[PDB]
């Protein structure tokens, strides 16, 4: 088929499949969740391992006091799309000294994902991004594809293994909006734990998670800062 | 061929073979004419390839009966017109087998596997009458 | 399907980073290891002559007092990442007047490696290790040629990385002394290379918190050479 | 006269034409596109000729043309 | 449903939540299923598969399983 | 992917492409070098100059500064591309920086400046493998072999061109645990290594020595003889 | 015992063809007919087809072992008809067992964008995936696959009515290693001291058919120094023939 190539080119279908392609390439694996409250907002991704003598990956960065974001894959796009973030709140606290709205941000950084889809000499993006945040207006949860689309959303999942997590999602989202923190990330931890794999139990080893909320700014939670939240899990009942 | 009587056709007699398709025009079934004392001074080829190849088509106790299992296969290299087809030749020739040269390219048939085929079909018509002393000219086709 | 990586595969993969994960293996075997005690690297000396200058294959190198290096792949390539990473040491000197974390080397080094795909070169057929013993403690770090980095307790790269790495998960923990942990990566390393150990085909060096200096651990270490 | 089952596989095309040969107690001519892209210049041509001949002399008859986008193209 | 009554199963079954379970499928992949599920209660020594069969049959023949996310490129 | 382009991967990691630059390189002339107890020298050959011919032009080595040269086997478009590089960096470096000029610097830029035209597309890298020999490196002589894939490396005695494929072995079957004793036995085993050449009689086979601290000096036709008779006469008595 | 290692895969090869058809009692009375046939892919070309020569050999049963290139000739059209013709052959035996090789050169799906080529494949490849029967659809026959890429195996193949059960396999482990030369030790007459449990170490991931060509190797050691018998040195420098000059 010779309709796969640089994302100038239609498919005679009307599609560009590359960016399929990319899409794709986000489903490769092990779960992340995030979901947001009247409250607060939170983010999780699972540090993977490689062996019994190498570190699990963290997957969770900070963008700004009052937003942050969570990342797929090998972050070649991920992280320095994040630091662009970052420097975009810091312009904002240079011209105004505001925490810039969630949603004013993540349409730029939208518009900045559809620019290489246009023109020739830069791949798509191979990640998919996760954002929790807060500001003047609220607390939202933000996420955005190589298909360069931002959605505001209640809660969302990006992986594999983890159509039980959107599915939980989709049943407790009646629940999210009104929850507070420890409610909305002992929500997002049960959807992570309809995720566990057949011979596996959730461990502090490799949940990670990133909170954010109206008077918190974004911070990110480890192994020991994890289990006072994944106290309240879901049991494991028949 | 067989002698058969003219009227009932019943067969009364057998008769010498002059026949069967160009197969054997590919094969050569006669042991090569050059031999070990024409390849002038290339000397430690002819104690390699003894050791290799030459032993086992009139000695196979010493690939089969020793303890041992035979081998498979000796690869030849240096510039064309070095003696490569000039030495196998000469090792052939130091037996009785028949000896079968094919260059690596020759063989390109058309739809899936029919060149293994006609690497297959030597293979297949070596014991049919005595074994046989393979050469492919030009081995560079094949893997890279 | 593979003549750039502007596109990725209908699996959604680049057909270029994994034939970079296998062009680990075109040079000779590599270690790493972390302990409390510090950061130790080792790379097989295989020669190709002799007679070549046997230290001119530098692929255990000192980045700077406090950290080090080894590489696996070609060795051209790994020059300009190497030699990234000792320069980013000096820019520290003469900017903030104080040294430099291996983690902000690391994250420099991995910012130069990740160009190939959104500039506006070409990807680097090379995976580096180092180690250091900065600010924040010992700390191995590990880095494939996509231009990511990983901490590392321990490490293998080059030729019978995999093998080297799965044995050694039976005989390593985060914290012993850096001795052990040289001599149980030596008992591993005299079978990955190719037969038997010397200068020729043998190569280590280490840094720890009691040592910011003389990285190059090199004809001193004899004895646990020939204690093993 | 003509029924195309159209769909992406899996779904149950072969199996709802092998049932309707089924219940019908008619003759079922069962048949792929992929057995008539065969080599000779003209073969595929008499092959179809040939086998709506046999049908018309089977009179009840169901040809079934199993993958025609071999042939449709 | 068919295939579980040609099958014989064991009653305690939410066919629903199977297919529930079935997300995106193809008739012939469910198909598969049914009678995967049948042997690996030949592997549980049950004399006749129930739910936990069909689960754990579709959490093998789901997918090839893929490669691993966190360090794709 | 395929041999096809320089800037990709082979599907086992190889760069059939870039590799190519051994029989680039190989179809060349033929060069040795080596460092003496002292003093490097160097010798050619394969000049076959075509009666109207000279190998005046040929120029297979030429002196870059007065502590540093190299030997260019290859292609010579590249290698006198090579030369107006190497000499003029040198000479401006030591004219105008701080800092002097060694072997190991011009080494060193050579190497970065094939890497980096590997490092694009639409710019060929250069297909040629020299050996660059120097007489100041913190005052110390040595040898480099550069290779056009932009890896360098240090040598005690090397050879290029056509000759690089015997030689490799040939070294290691006579080099002595004593460097070439002062320039004879230097002179001596430069011979040696070159009678893999055509001849080796010297009708055609030429060489050079740079004392480590004096420029290049020419075994000039005048009086190559004399080396070449030191050489005929060493395998003559050893018979 | 002569698979190297994989004794685990052809175990589990037999729960689906030696299984229900010497032990019947658990198929289809729990509900289901014994099934027949079962797929394998693992090494490059290592040890493969030789598994369903063991379970032949314990099945009592008729071997035939086909590749692509017996389904071909010049003469088109009949490639397919070969499948059918080897079916019927098989049914006329008292029962048989039928393995194919290199299954994805035949069941490998359809190739429209080809323009033509080599095409005979399109008219003969689907009259043995269509053609072929299940466990519920076959007669009295036993059917084995294998091939060493699987990526591209049409599903057809894959799902039921041509497979009951898929197998992977590897390198050769360290069990399996030992044990090839285990095996091999049987195979030569040798100096039977060796120290086996060290040559599938100094062995790294590797295949057990280079293990087979490494004994020959141990057996051209003998012969070049023309001696009687094969030495533990014979052994250890063989095995580097392969792990030194195939790998330097
Ligand atoms: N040892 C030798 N004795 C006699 N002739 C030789 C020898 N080696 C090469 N030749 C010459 O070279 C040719 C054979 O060399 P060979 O390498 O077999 O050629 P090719 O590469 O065409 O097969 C013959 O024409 C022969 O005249
Ligand atoms: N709803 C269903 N009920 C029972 N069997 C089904 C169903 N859907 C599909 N199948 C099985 O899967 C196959 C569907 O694929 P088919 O119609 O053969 O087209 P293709 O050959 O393109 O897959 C059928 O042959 C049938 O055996
Ligand atoms: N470990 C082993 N044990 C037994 N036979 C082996 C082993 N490794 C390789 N073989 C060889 O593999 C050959 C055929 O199997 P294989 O080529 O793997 O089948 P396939 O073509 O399906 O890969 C046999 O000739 C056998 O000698």
Same mark, same amino acid.
């Given at each position: 088929n010779?309709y796969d190539?640089?994302?100038?080119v239609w498919?005679?279908?009307?599609?560009i499949?590359?960016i399929?392609?990319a899409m794709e390439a986000?489903?490769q694996?092990?779960?992340?969740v995030?979901?947001?409250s009247?409250?607060?907002a939170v983010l999780?991704?699972?540090?993977?391992?490689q062996?019994?003598?190498?570190?699990?990956?963290?997957?969770?960065?900070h963008?700004?006091?009052h937003?942050?974001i969570?990342?797929?894959?090998?972050?070649?796009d991920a992280?320095?799309?994040?630091?662009?973030?970052?420097?975009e709140?810091?312009?904002?606290?240079?011209?105004?000294?505001?925490?810039?709205?969630?949603?004013?941000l993540?349409?730029?950084?939208?518009?900045?994902?559809?620019?290489?889809?246009?023109?020739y000499?830069?791949?798509?993006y191979?990640?998919?991004?996760?954002?929790?945040?807060?500001?003047?207006?609220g607390?939202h949860?933000?996420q955005?594809?190589?298909?360069?689309?931002?959605?505001?959303?209640?809660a969302m999942?990006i992986?594999?293994?983890?159509?039980?997590?959107?599915?939980?999602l989709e049943?407790?989202?009646?629940?999210f909006?009104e929850?507070?923190l420890?409610?909305?990330?002992?929500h997002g931890?049960?959807a992570?734990?309809?995720?566990?794999?057949?011979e596996?139990?959730?461990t502090?080893?490799n949940?990670?998670?990133?909170?954010?909320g109206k008077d918190?700014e974004?911070?990110?939670y480890?192994?020991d800062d994890v289990?006072?939240?994944?106290?309240?899990?879901?049991?494991?009942?028949? | 061929s067989?002698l058969?009587?003219h009227?009932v056709?019943?067969?009364?007699?057998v008769?010498?073979?002059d026949?069967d398709?160009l197969?054997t025009?590919?094969?050569?079934?006669?042991?090569?004419?050059?031999?070990?004392?024409?390849?002038?001074g290339?000397?430690?080829?002819?104690?390699?390839?003894?050791e290799?190849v030459?032993?086992?088509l009139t000695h196979?106790?010493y690939?089969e009966?020793m303890?041992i299992?035979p081998?498979?296969?000796?690869?030849?290299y240096?510039?064309?017109?070095?003696?490569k087809?000039l030495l196998?030749?000469?090792v052939?020739?130091?037996?009785s087998?028949?000896?079968?040269?094919?260059?690596?390219?020759?063989?390109?048939?058309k739809y899936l596997?029919?060149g293994?085929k006609?690497?297959?079909?030597?293979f297949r018509?070596?014991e049919?009458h005595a074994?046989?002393?393979?050469?492919?000219?030009?081995?560079?086709a094949?893997?890279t | 399907?593979?003549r750039?990586?502007?596109?990725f595969?209908?699996?959604?993969?680049?057909?270029?980073?994994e034939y970079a994960?296998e062009?680990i293996?075109?040079?000779?075997?590599?270690?790493?290891?972390?302990?409390s005690?510090?950061?130790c690297?080792?790379?097989?000396?295989?020669?190709?002559?002799?007679?070549?200058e046997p230290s001119?294959?530098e692929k255990?190198?000192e980045?700077?007092?406090?950290?080090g290096?080894?590489?696996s792949?070609?060795?051209?390539?790994?020059?300009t990442l190497?030699?990234?990473?000792r320069?980013?040491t000096?820019?520290?000197?003469?900017?903030?007047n104080?040294?430099?974390?291996?983690?902000?080397?690391?994250?420099?080094?991995?910012?130069?490696?990740?160009?190939?795909?959104?500039?506006?070169?070409?990807?680097?057929?090379?995976?580096?290790?180092?180690?250091?013993?900065?600010?924040?403690?010992?700390?191995?770090?590990?880095?494939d040629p996509s231009?990511?980095?990983?901490?590392?307790?321990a490490?293998?790269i080059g030729?019978?990385s995999?093998?080297?790495?799965?044995?050694?998960?039976?005989?390593?923990?985060?914290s012993?002394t850096?001795?052990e942990a040289?001599?149980?990566?030596l008992?591993?390393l005299?079978?990955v290379?190719?037969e038997?150990?010397?200068?020729?085909?043998?190569?280590?060096?280490?840094?720890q918190?009691?040592q910011?200096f003389?990285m190059f651990?090199?004809?001193?270490?004899?004895?646990?050479?020939k204690?093993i | 006269?003509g029924?195309?089952?159209?769909?992406?596989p899996?779904?149950?095309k072969?199996?709802?034409?092998?049932?309707?040969?089924?219940?019908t107690?008619?003759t079922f001519?069962?048949l792929?596109?992929?057995?008539l892209?065969?080599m000779?210049i003209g073969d595929?041509?008499?092959?179809?000729?040939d086998?709506?001949?046999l049908?018309k002399?089977?009179?009840?008859?169901?040809?079934?043309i199993?993958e025609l986008?071999?042939?449709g193209? | 449903?068919?295939?579980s009554?040609?099958?014989?199963?064991?009653p305690?079954?939410?066919?629903?939540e199977?297919?529930?379970?079935?997300?995106?499928?193809?008739?012939?992949?469910?198909?598969?299923?049914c009678?995967?599920?049948?042997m690996?209660?030949?592997?549980?020594?049950a004399?006749?598969?129930?739910?936990?069969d069909?689960?754990e049959?579709?959490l093998?023949?789901?997918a090839?399983?893929?490669?691993?996310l966190?360090y794709?490129? | 992917?395929?041999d096809?382009?320089i800037?990709?991967?082979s599907p086992?990691?190889?760069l059939?492409?870039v590799?190519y630059?051994?029989?680039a390189?190989?179809?060349?002339?033929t060069?040795?070098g080596?460092?003496g107890?002292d003093?490097?020298?160097? &010798?050619?050959?394969? +000049? %076959? @100059?075509?009666k109207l011919?000279?190998?005046?032009?040929?120029?297979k080595?030429?002196?870059? #500064? /007065?502590?540093?040269?190299?030997?260019?086997?290859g292609?010579?478009?590249?290698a006198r591309i090579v030369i107006?590089?190497a000499?003029?960096?040198?000479?401006?470096?030591?004219?105008?920086?701080?800092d002097?000029?060694?072997?190991?610097?011009i080494?060193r830029?050579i190497?970065?400046?094939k890497?980096r035209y590997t490092?694009?597309?639409?710019?060929?890298?250069?297909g040629?493998?020299?050996?660059?020999?120097?007489?100041d490196?913190?005052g110390?002589p040595?040898?480099?072999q550069?290779?056009?894939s932009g890896?360098?490396?240090?040598?005690?005695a090397?050879?290029? &061109?056509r000759?690089? +494929? %015997? @030689?490799?072995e040939?070294l290691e079957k006579?080099?002595?645990?004593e460097?070439?004793?002062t #320039? /004879?036995?230097t002179?001596?085993?430069?011979?040696?290594?070159?009678?893999?050449?055509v001849?080796?009689?010297?009708?055609?086979?030429?060489?050079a020595?740079?004392?480590?601290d004096?420029?290049?000096?020419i075994?000039?036709?005048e009086?190559?003889?004399?080396?070449?008779?030191?050489?005929?006469?060493?395998?003559e008595?050893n018979? | 015992?002569?698979?190297?290692?994989?004794?685990?895969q052809?175990?589990?090869?037999?729960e689906?063809?030696?299984?229900?058809?010497?032990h019947?009692?658990?198929?289809?009375?729990?509900?289901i007919?014994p099934?027949?046939?079962?797929?394998?892919?693992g090494?490059?070309?290592?040890?493969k087809?030789?598994c369903?020569?063991?379970?032949a050999?314990?099945?009592?049963?008729?071997?035939?072992?086909?590749?692509?290139?017996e389904?071909?000739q010049?003469?088109v059209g009949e490639?397919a008809r070969?499948?059918?013709?080897?079916?019927?052959?098989?049914?006329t035996?008292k029962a048989?067992?039928?393995?194919?090789?290199?299954?994805?050169?035949?069941?490998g799906?359809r190739f429209?964008?080809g323009?033509?080529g080599?095409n005979?494949v399109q008219?003969?490849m689907?009259?043995?995936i269509?053609q072929?029967?299940?466990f519920?659809?076959?007669?009295?026959?036993?059917?084995?696959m294998?091939?060493?890429?699987?990526?591209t195996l049409?599903?057809?193949?894959?799902?039921?009515g041509?497979?009951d059960?898929?197998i992977?396999?590897?390198?050769?482990?360290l069990?399996?290693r030992?044990?090839?030369?285990?095996?091999?030790?049987r195979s030569?007459?040798?100096e039977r001291?060796?120290?086996?449990?060290?040559?599938?170490?100094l062995?790294?991931?590797?295949?057990?058919?280079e293990i087979?060509?490494?004994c020959?190797?141990?057996?051209?050691f003998?012969?070049?120094?023309?001696?009687?018998?094969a030495?533990?040195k014979?052994?250890?420098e063989?095995?580097?023939?392969?792990?030194?000059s195939?790998?330097?």
């Open positions: 010779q190539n640089d994302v100038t498919s005679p279908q009307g599609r499949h590359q399929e392609y986000v489903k694996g092990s779960a992340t995030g979901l947001k009247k409250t607060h999780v991704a699972l540090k993977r391992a062996s019994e003598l190498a570190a699990h990956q963290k997957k969770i960065l963008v700004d006091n937003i942050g969570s990342i797929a894959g090998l972050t070649a992280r320095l799309l994040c630091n662009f973030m970052r420097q709140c810091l312009d904002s606290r240079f011209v105004f000294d505001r925490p810039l709205p969630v949603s004013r993540v349409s730029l950084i939208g518009s900045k994902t559809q620019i290489p889809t246009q023109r000499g830069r791949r798509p191979g990640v998919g991004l996760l954002i929790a945040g807060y500001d003047d207006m607390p949860i933000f955005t594809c190589p298909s360069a689309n931002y959605f505001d959303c209640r999942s992986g594999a293994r983890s159509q039980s997590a959107r599915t939980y049943r407790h989202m009646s629940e909006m929850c507070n420890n409610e909305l990330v002992k931890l049960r992570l734990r309809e995720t566990l794999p057949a596996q139990d959730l502090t080893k949940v990670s998670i990133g909170i954010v918190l974004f911070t990110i480890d192994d289990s006072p939240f994944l106290e309240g899990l879901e049991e494991r009942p028949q | 067989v058969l009587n009227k056709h019943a067969v009364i007699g008769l010498m073979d026949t398709p197969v025009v590919m094969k050569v079934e006669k042991a090569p004419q050059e031999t070990y004392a024409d390849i002038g290339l000397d430690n080829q002819i104690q390699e390839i003894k290799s030459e032993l086992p196979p106790e690939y009966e303890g299992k081998p498979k296969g000796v690869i030849l240096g510039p064309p017109g070095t003696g087809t196998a030749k000469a052939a020739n130091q037996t087998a028949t000896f079968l040269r094919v260059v690596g390219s020759e063989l390109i048939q596997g029919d293994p006609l690497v297959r079909e030597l018509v070596a049919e074994p046989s002393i393979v050469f492919i000219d030009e081995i560079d094949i893997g | 399907y593979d750039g990586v502007n596109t595969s209908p699996e959604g993969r680049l057909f270029q980073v994960i062009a293996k075109l040079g000779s075997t590599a270690i790493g290891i972390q302990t005690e510090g950061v690297l080792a790379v097989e000396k295989r020669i190709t002559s002799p007679l070549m001119s294959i255990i190198v980045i700077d007092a406090h950290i290096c080894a590489m792949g070609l060795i051209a390539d790994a020059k190497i030699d990234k990473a320069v980013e000096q820019n520290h000197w003469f900017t903030y104080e040294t430099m974390t291996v983690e902000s080397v690391t994250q420099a080094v991995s910012n130069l490696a990740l160009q190939f795909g959104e500039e506006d070169s070409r990807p680097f057929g090379v995976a580096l290790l180092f180690g250091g013993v900065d600010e924040k403690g010992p700390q191995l770090f590990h880095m231009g990511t980095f990983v901490q590392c307790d490490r293998a030729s019978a995999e093998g080297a790495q799965s044995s050694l998960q039976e005989v390593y923990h985060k012993m850096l001795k040289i001599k149980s990566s008992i591993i005299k079978q290379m190719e038997k150990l010397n200068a020729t085909n043998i190569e280590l060096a280490t840094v918190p009691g910011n003389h651990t090199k004809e001193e270490l004899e004895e646990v050479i204690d | 006269k029924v195309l089952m159209y769909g992406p899996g779904t149950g072969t199996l709802l034409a092998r049932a309707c040969a089924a219940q107690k008619a001519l069962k792929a596109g992929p057995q892209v065969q000779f595929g041509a008499k092959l179809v000729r086998a709506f001949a049908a002399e089977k009179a009840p008859s169901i040809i079934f199993d986008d071999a042939i193209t | 449903q068919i295939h009554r040609k099958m014989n199963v064991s305690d079954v939410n066919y629903e199977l297919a529930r379970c079935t997300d995106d499928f193809n008739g012939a992949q469910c198909k598969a299923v009678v995967e599920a049948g690996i209660a030949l592997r549980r020594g004399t006749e598969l129930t739910h936990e069909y689960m049959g579709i093998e023949v789901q090839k399983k893929k490669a691993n966190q794709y490129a | 992917s395929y096809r382009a800037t990709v991967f086992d990691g190889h059939f492409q590799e630059a051994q029989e390189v190989k179809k060349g002339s060069a040795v080596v460092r107890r003093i490097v020298v160097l &010798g050619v050959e394969k +000049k %076959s @100059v075509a011919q000279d190998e005046r032009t040929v120029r080595i030429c002196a870059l #500064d /007065d502590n540093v040269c190299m030997a260019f086997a292609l010579t478009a590249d107006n590089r000499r003029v960096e040198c000479q401006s470096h030591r004219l105008t920086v701080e002097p000029v060694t072997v190991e610097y080494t830029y190497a970065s400046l890497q490092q694009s597309n639409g710019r060929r890298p250069f040629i493998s020299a050996l660059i020999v120097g007489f490196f913190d110390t040595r040898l480099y550069t290779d056009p890896t360098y490396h240090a040598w005690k090397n050879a290029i &061109g000759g690089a +494929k %015997s @030689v490799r040939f006579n080099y002595t645990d460097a070439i004793e #320039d /004879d036995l002179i001596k085993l430069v011979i040696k290594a070159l009678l893999e050449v001849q080796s009689g010297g009708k055609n086979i030429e060489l020595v740079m004392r480590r004096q420029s290049l000096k075994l000039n036709p009086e190559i003889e004399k080396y070449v008779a030191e050489i005929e006469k060493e395998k008595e018979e | 015992s002569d698979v190297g290692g994989c004794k685990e052809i175990e589990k090869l037999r689906v063809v030696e299984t229900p058809l010497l019947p009692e658990r198929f289809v009375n729990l509900g007919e099934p027949k046939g079962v797929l394998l892919f090494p490059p070309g290592t040890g087809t030789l369903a020569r063991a379970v050999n314990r099945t009592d049963a008729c071997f035939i072992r086909v590749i692509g290139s389904l071909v010049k003469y490639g070969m499948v059918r013709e080897l079916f019927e052959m098989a049914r035996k048989c067992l039928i393995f194919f090789d290199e299954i994805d050169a035949i069941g799906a429209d964008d323009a033509g080599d005979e008219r003969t689907l009259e043995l269509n072929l029967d299940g519920d659809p076959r007669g009295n026959i036993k059917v084995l294998a091939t060493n890429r699987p990526d049409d599903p057809a193949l894959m799902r039921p041509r497979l059960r898929k992977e396999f590897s390198l050769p482990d069990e399996g030992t044990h090839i030369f285990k095996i091999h030790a030569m007459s040798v001291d060796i120290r086996f449990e060290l040559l599938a170490r062995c790294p991931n590797s295949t057990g058919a087979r060509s490494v020959t190797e141990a057996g051209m003998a012969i070049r120094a023309r001696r009687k018998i030495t533990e014979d052994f250890l063989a095995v580097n023939k392969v792990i030194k195939y790998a330097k």
